[PDB]
Design a protein around this ligand. Structure first.
Ligand code: MH0
Ligand code: T6C
Length: 133
């Protein structure tokens, strides 16, 4: 289920983070235009940029922490507030989770893809309730 999936992702987090973020950028090319440093680069070129691997892993680590603290795929409102108060839009987040769920469904592994869909919706809603546009 959802909690085992957190363990699965953590066990190869850099690879999963990069591959899911690349799936997001390739599914939504316009989002990539908000990453000036990644425009005009293929997957393999992105994987050679230090801050691509470092930033994608850091984002997914925080996602895993929030997932770990959630109950029934509902994140803590206090985690959402911490996120909004750290240095975006709920629309871009919703698109990341669409790509994440599609990636899980195409994997041969028994990810709980419906729970991640719910978690993404609930995080988007909690971020909006906590003041993110
Ligand atoms: C595209 C959707 C998207 C998601 C989901 C996302 C998820 C998350 N981020 Fe982060 N982030 C996103 C898009 C950006 C952008 C576009 C920038 C610039 C950015 N994020 C930048 C940041 C920065 C500024 C410092 C930097 O990273 O170099 C932080 C601290 C950050 N993020 C945290 C997080 C955290 C924590 C999460 C986990 C919930
Ligand atoms: O370099 C970044 C990456 Cl790869 C992903 C996100 Cl979500 C943000 C930044 Cl600044």
């Amino acid at each position: 289920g959802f909690k085992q999936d957190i363990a699965t992702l953590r066990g190869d987090l850099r690879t999963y983070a990069q591959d899911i973020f690349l799936a997001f950028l390739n599914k939504y090319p316009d989002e990539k235009r908000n990453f000036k440093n990644y425009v005009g680069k293929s997957d393999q070129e992105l994987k050679s940029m230090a801050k691509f691997g470092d930033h994608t892993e850091k984002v997914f680590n925080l996602m895993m922490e929030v997932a770990d603290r959630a109950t029934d795929c509902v994140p803590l409102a206090s985690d959402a507030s911490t996120l909004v108060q750290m240095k975006l839009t709920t629309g871009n987040f919703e698109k990341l989770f669409v790509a994440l769920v599609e990636y899980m469904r195409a994997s041969g592994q028994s990810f709980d893809s419906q729970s991640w869909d719910r978690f993404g919706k609930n995080l988007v809603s909690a971020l909006s309730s906590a003041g993110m546009k």
